[PDB]
Amino acid sequence: TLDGWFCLHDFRSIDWAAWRELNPGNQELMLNELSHFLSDMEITKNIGEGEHTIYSILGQKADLVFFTLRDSLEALNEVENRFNKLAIADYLLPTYSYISVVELSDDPYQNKGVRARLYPALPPKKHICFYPMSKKRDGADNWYMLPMEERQQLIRDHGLIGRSYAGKVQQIIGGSIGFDDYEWGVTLFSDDALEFKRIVTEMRFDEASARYAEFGSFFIGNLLLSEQLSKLFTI
Amino acid sequence: KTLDGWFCLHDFRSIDWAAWRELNPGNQELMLNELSHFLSDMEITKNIGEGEHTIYSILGQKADLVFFTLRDSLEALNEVENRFNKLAIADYLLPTYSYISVVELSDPYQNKGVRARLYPALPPKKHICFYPMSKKRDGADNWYMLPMEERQQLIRDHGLIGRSYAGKVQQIIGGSIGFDDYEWGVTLFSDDALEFKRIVTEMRFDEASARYAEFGSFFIGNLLLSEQLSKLFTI
Amino acid sequence: VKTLDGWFCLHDFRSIDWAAWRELNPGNQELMLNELSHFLSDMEITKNIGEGEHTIYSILGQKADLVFFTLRDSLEALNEVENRFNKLAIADYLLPTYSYISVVELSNYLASHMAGGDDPYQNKGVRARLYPALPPKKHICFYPMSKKRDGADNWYMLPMEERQQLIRDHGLIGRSYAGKVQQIIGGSIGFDDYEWGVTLFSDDALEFKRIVTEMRFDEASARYAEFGSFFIGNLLLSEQLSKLFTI
Amino acid sequence: TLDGWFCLHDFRSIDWAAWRELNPGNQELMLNELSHFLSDMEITKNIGEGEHTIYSILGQKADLVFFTLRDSLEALNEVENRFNKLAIADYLLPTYSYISVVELSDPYQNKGVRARLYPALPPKKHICFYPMSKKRDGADNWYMLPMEERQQLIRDHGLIGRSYAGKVQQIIGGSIGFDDYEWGVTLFSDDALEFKRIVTEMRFDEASARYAEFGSFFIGNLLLSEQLSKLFTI
Amino acid sequence: VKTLDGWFCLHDFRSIDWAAWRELNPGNQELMLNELSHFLSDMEITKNIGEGEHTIYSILGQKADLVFFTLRDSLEALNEVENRFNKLAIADYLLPTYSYISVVELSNYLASHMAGGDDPYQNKGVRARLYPALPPKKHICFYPMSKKRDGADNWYMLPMEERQQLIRDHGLIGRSYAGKVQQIIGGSIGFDDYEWGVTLFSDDALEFKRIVTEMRFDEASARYAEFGSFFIGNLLLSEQLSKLFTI
Ligand SMILES: [K+]
Ligand SMILES: [K+]
Ligand SMILES: [K+]
Ligand SMILES: [K+]
Ligand SMILES: [K+]
């Protein structure tokens, strides 16, 4: 398999109780520093050395997710440390995270059609859906014990689903074997959140997932631009 | 395929009685008045027909209160969530659990009986019961690997039980595949709590649930009107 | 599959915040304990009029320091006890660690009374089970449990007569411990995370270990029982609460 | 099944941050109170009413374990409450605990049996604790086995512990009805590698291989009362 | 089913409390960083006299920020390092998030040395594996694991000759990533919650994903492996600390 950018899903909850105690002046300074940090990220993306986006997560799991993509673990780890060193980061409590690397099955690494997948531009879709997953190794339902022939056939039929949801849902698959607790981090983008439920359900009735898919938690959110972050942190 | 309605937020909170006690009577009253106006705007959204909301006092240590909110978009639902947390009193309402889903039903949308289910008016029943569930995918007991006909039969016989409790137990089924950790969010309303125990027990002896259902935690509570909030928060 | 249901129950486990408690002066500790004694006397009044029950046991281990087992005829009454308790000044030092909600349950697998076109709730023998007076046994044992639904071992796919047989044989063991162990079975399907909440009372702790062990070799439990956490404790009277909260 | 002393495994973590903020004056006073506490524990030991020991645990699970044995649940709980009421206990955060009773699958007045039911804790250099239960999962159901089969398994299992005798001392505490697992196993040895050897060897015997379910494992080093002041001294 | 055992191991995962650390002035932060430096210099001495090893990596994600992998020849020494570490003033800002105790292990499935009535612990080649020098690779990968004992897939019920074949085929994959991935196998049966603590080192993190994936398709792991949490990190030298702890 061919690998692309290293990915970080960073889920945060806003400590409103502490944030409320800050005067408007200091709240302004911390947001000013954040905007500067966000402009930094934008520059890295403009030179094609990374990607990033922010979505507001629903429910008590988190308030925000910071999805970041970079060319190396060193180039990903300093973003994480640089972010935590921000003043406002004290009010962004860690609730969950995920580490992965963009994954995909004559040089392919120059094929500009393949580059668009390994180093994907993040679409500004209204909504986002994230969940980790793994392939089962339980009794008769053991994905990794399947023959090469049958196992590939399951992947074939599975791919036809996402193929049918083209223009409705965009997927980013990140392998996490050796990097995190599950085997894949799946990120979905769409302007209609209902499409997330439809594709994952339709997938769940397909044998590939119906028999071998193990799922972690599901996180769903809405697009959050810089022009929306200010009113968000304004009580 | 299914039909979807309002997006749902079950927001469970525990009351920080230790912290709340430290507030003088004056400050406690101001925060209640701020909450009162918040609920007033919730009532506006309810009247205009762009959602619903209700509050119940939960029994046990899982929570003290549940804020069940329904809206016509995820943006609107996240708005209520953040706006709620920005309240002064919210600092004393600690998050213990939450669930995200959308009202689900298996043209119809302009059929005045269907929309009544997809956009349900919350009845002022004396008790509520909530629990998340999922259909199992474990060996011989795999719901999503069953033939279509066998599935319909199991759903059919399951449906027979629900209609037998009509007039005693009102249900709201919220699909959460792609939205949360389980596959459905079940909400029951009844004036007799024991009806919850009767319908869920009877269901559990039906094959659809007996063989294929997985259950999360169960939350039961009592109806709490806005007028009774002042008395509740008075030590 | 049918049940007779009595009092709604609350097992309220609490841990004592000794760090915060030792900061109060004896005068303030006295006022809080005074308010608690009043609260507990209120509970006793409800008991004396036959509209509920309550008891306190000291739990061993880090799971909890105290359990407050309370029984009431409605969830509105039960919740009110809960809210009223937390509003106590001393409750700020009683940290929640675990709880359970159930209702006293009598299943119809075996009979509890003669069936003669007759109202069971008027049967005093039945009422003594539905609305049980709590015995002042020296020790308590609580654990939630459920019936498995796992492949070949699926309790809820069994025929009625087969479940009857299993409950019957299970019962034989249960009644061999009559006079040594008293049992309160609370159904919690639809009310909590497990399907039942079992409370045992005895003047000898080892009896808890004996009955549960012997049950575990009986097919009803050996094959179909799924257990949660176990809690063991000692009876705590009001006349030794002041000694407990005194450092 | 014969039953002896009631047991408490009390695992604690040291709040170094809060402990550091205390000036050495308070720290010494709290350590003195703990010394008087442990002094009274030794009296109970010498008269023959109970036992106690302390071990420094490795890893983040805990820093210390207080293993206490008493004749009744009243006395055990009293020590537990007496311990928490100590000023120093505020800096000893609870991380894990276990309740059991010394189990032995008129014998009660025989010195030989009493040595088992009411065991003196050896001052071995190391300790190992883990809870466990017997499986009731599908075809692997220990409690649905015929007695004759179950007896042979226990017999084949017993042979292992006896070969490790003198190198590893074991205290089995039954916890059915008392805690979340069915047994609490405590091992003592002057060589921690012996723990790894006996548990490994046991796990290949059909009794544990097929029917054992384990909880968390805790390893620690012997810690005397005189070593506490230098442990808590930064 | 014997093993050769070397240094006792401690993986100490920590997270940086940036909020509290920020409140500290650079004068005090400097002082704590200096104390940490003297601590690591003492660790270097122990390493130079040959009484153990130690290294530090920066973990990615919220699981941790740092891991302090330490190796010693006794549990007394290993626990003293642990106690000394926490007694550091800077340690208050290093919150414990996870840990794993184990000992460097060589299984007897395949031979590590030739026969001869010849003590293996005197073999220079064996000692190099039991008391391994930590390679300064760019990245690290740690994960605990255990062999399954679930129904048909029961590793500990397998015949010896079958476990051998499985480990043999398993070893071929590991031996194929030579010069790219170095492995430290720490046995933890009786020491921690899993049966092994596996530590990988490589200058290319993708090799971790490559080896574990290929391994997971081999029957030994495809059928019998149980995995815990995975931790991925970047190498961090003592001179890089002050850089890291500068806001
Ligand atoms: K949120
Ligand atoms: K409550
Ligand atoms: K206790
Ligand atoms: K430790
Ligand atoms: K990190």
What would the 3-class secondary structure string for E13-78 be?
EEEECHHHHHHCCHHHHHHHHHHHHHHHHHHHHHHHCCCEEEEEEEECCCCCCEEEEEEECCHHHH
Q: How far apart are CA C95 and CA C15, in angstroms?
A: 5
Contact between E140 and E232 under an 8 Å Cβ cutoff? The reply is yes
Active-site residue, selected from the candidate residues C93, C98, C143, C194: C143
The fold for domain C1-136 equals: Alpha-Beta Plaits (3.30.70)
Asked if D217 lies within 8 A of E76 by C-beta distance, the reply is no
Tabulate helix, strand, coil % of chain C (nearest 5).
40, 30, 30
Q: Is A136 annotated as a binding residue?
A: no
Active-site residue, selected from the candidate residues B92, B99, B131, B212: B131
Q: Is D225 annotated as a binding residue?
A: no
Q: Do chains D and B touch (3 or more CB pairs under 8 A)?
A: no
Q: In angstroms, what is the span from residue D168 Cα to ligand 2's centroid?
A: 49
What is the helix (H) or strand (E) element at residue C145, kind and residue range? strand C139-147
Q: In chain A, which residues are last before a break of more than 2.5 Å from C to the next N? A: 105
Tokens of A35: 């905007």
| B59/C contact by beta carbon, under 8 A | yes
> CATH second-level architecture of D124-234?
2-Layer Sandwich (3.30)
- Contact partners for chain B, using 3 or more CB pairs closer than 8 A, are A, C
Q: How far apart are CA C1 and CA B202, in angstroms?
A: 7
| A125/B contact by beta carbon, under 8 A | no
| D166/C contact by beta carbon, under 8 A | no
Alpha carbon of D1: minimum distance to chain C alpha carbons (Å): 9
The fold for domain B125-235 equals: Alpha-Beta Plaits (3.30.70)
Q: Which of B17, B126, B194 is opposite residue C92, by nearest beta carbon?
A: B17
Q: In chain E, which residues are last before a break of more than 2.5 Å from C to the next N? A: none
Q: Which of D81, D144, D177 is opposite residue C141, by nearest beta carbon?
A: D177
Q: Under DSSP, is residue A108 helix (H, G, I), strand (E, B) or coil?
A: helix
- How many C-beta atoms lie closer than 10 Å to residue C4's C-beta? 18
Asked if E234 lies within 8 A of A77 by C-beta distance, the reply is yes
Contact between C9 and C75 under an 8 Å Cβ cutoff? The reply is no
Q: In angstroms, what is the span from residue A58 Cα to ligand 1's centroid?
A: 4
Asked if A56 lies within 8 A of B78 by C-beta distance, the reply is yes
Tokens of D201: 């060897």
Q: Which of C16, C58, C212 is opposite residue D77, by nearest beta carbon?
A: C58
Q: Which residues contact B233 (CB under 8 A, 6 or more apart)?
A: B15, B20, B28, B32
- How many C-beta atoms lie closer than 10 Å to residue E14's C-beta? 22
Contact between C76 and B222 under an 8 Å Cβ cutoff? The reply is yes
Domain boundaries, chain C: 1-136, 137-247
- Which residue in E71, E85, E192 has the most chain D C-beta atoms within 10 A of its own C-beta, making it the best mutation to test that interface? E192
Give the catalytic positions of E in this structure: 143
Residue type, C141: C
| A160/E contact by beta carbon, under 8 A | no
Chain D CB contacts of E1 under 8 Å are 200-201, 204
Residue A193's closest CA among D96, B75, B134? B75
* CA D233 to each of CA D55, D85, E32, E95: distance values in angstroms, whole numbers, following the listed order: 17, 22, 18, 20
Q: Which of A73, A74, A144 is opposite residue E216, by nearest beta carbon?
A: A144
**Does E1-136 match E137-247 in CATH topology?**
yes
Which chain D residue has the Cα nearest residue C228? Answer: D180
Asked if E10 lies within 8 A of D199 by C-beta distance, the reply is no
Q: Which CATH superfamily is domain D1-123 in?
A: Apc35880; domain 1 (3.30.70.1030)
Q: How far apart are CA C149 and CA C217, in angstroms?
A: 19
| E56/A contact by beta carbon, under 8 A | no
Q: Which of B196, B209, B235 is opposite residue C190, by nearest beta carbon?
A: B196
What burial letters (b/e) apply to E220-245, b meaning 16+ CB within 10 Å? Answer: bbbbbbbbbebbbbbbbeeeebeeeb
CA-CA-CA-CA torsion sign (A200, A205, A208, A212): positive
Note the ligand closest to the C-alpha atom of A61: 1
Which chain E residue has the Cα nearest residue A94? Answer: E62
Alpha carbon of A74: minimum distance to chain B alpha carbons (Å): 32
Alpha carbon of D198: minimum distance to chain C alpha carbons (Å): 27
| A117/B contact by beta carbon, under 8 A | no
CA-CA-CA-CA torsion sign (D28, D31, D37, D38): negative
Q: Is B158 annotated as a binding residue?
A: yes
Q: How far apart are CA E172 and CA A140, in angstroms?
A: 26
Q: Give yes or no: C143 in active site.
A: yes
Note the ligand closest to the C-alpha atom of A62: 1
Residue D194's closest CA among D172, D163, D157? D163
What is the helix (H) or strand (E) element at residue D195, kind and residue range? helix D192-203
Q: In angstroms, what is the span from residue C65 Cα to ligand 3's centroid?
A: 4
| B75/A contact by beta carbon, under 8 A | yes
Asked if E244 lies within 8 A of A81 by C-beta distance, the reply is yes
CATH of C137-247 among 3.30.70.1030, 3.30.428.10, 2.60.130.10, 3.40.190.10: 3.30.70.1030
Residue B185's closest CA among B196, B170, B174, B177? B174
Chain C CB contacts of D3 under 8 Å are 206, 209
Q: Which residues contact D125 (CB under 8 A, 6 or more apart)?
A: D189, D190, D191, D221, D222
Q: How far apart are CA B120 and CA B171, in angstroms?
A: 10
Asked if E230 lies within 8 A of A101 by C-beta distance, the reply is no
Contact between E200 and A165 under an 8 Å Cβ cutoff? The reply is no
Query: DSSP for chain B?
Result: --EEEEEEEEEEEEE-HHHHHHS-HHHHHHHHHHHHHHHHHHHHHHHTTSEEEEEEEEPSSS-SEEEEEEESSHHHHHHHHHHHHTSGGGGGEEEEEEEEEEEEE--GGG-TTTHHHHSPPPP--SEEEEEEEEE-EETTEEGGGS-HHHHHHHHHHHHHHHHHTTTT-EEEEEE-TTTSSSSEEEEEEESSTHHHHHHHHHHHTSHHHHTTEEE---EEEEE--GGGHHHHT--
Q: Is D157 annotated as a binding residue?
A: yes
Own/partner pairs, C41-45, CB within 8 angstroms, 24+ separation: C43/C70, C43/C81
What burial letters (b/e) apply to C217-243, b meaning 16+ CB within 10 Å? Answer: ebebbbbbbbbbebbbbbbbeeeebee
Q: In angstroms, what is the span from residue C62 Cα to ligand 3's centroid?
A: 5
| E18/D contact by beta carbon, under 8 A | no
Burial category of C73 from C-beta neighbours within 10 Å (exposed 0-12, middle 13-18, buried 19 and up): middle
Instruction: Give the method of determination.
Output: X-ray
Give chain B's largest Cα–Cα span.
64
- Which residue in A125, A165, A197, A224 has the most chain B C-beta atoms within 10 A of its own C-beta, making it the best mutation to test that interface? A197
Note the ligand closest to the C-alpha atom of B78: 1
- Which residue in A8, A85, A146, A184 has the most chain E C-beta atoms within 10 A of its own C-beta, making it the best mutation to test that interface? A85
Beta strand extents in chain A (DSSP E only): 2-14, 50-57, 64-70, 92-104, 127-135, 137-138, 141-142, 170-175, 184-190, 213-215, 219-223
> CATH second-level architecture of B1-124?
2-Layer Sandwich (3.30)
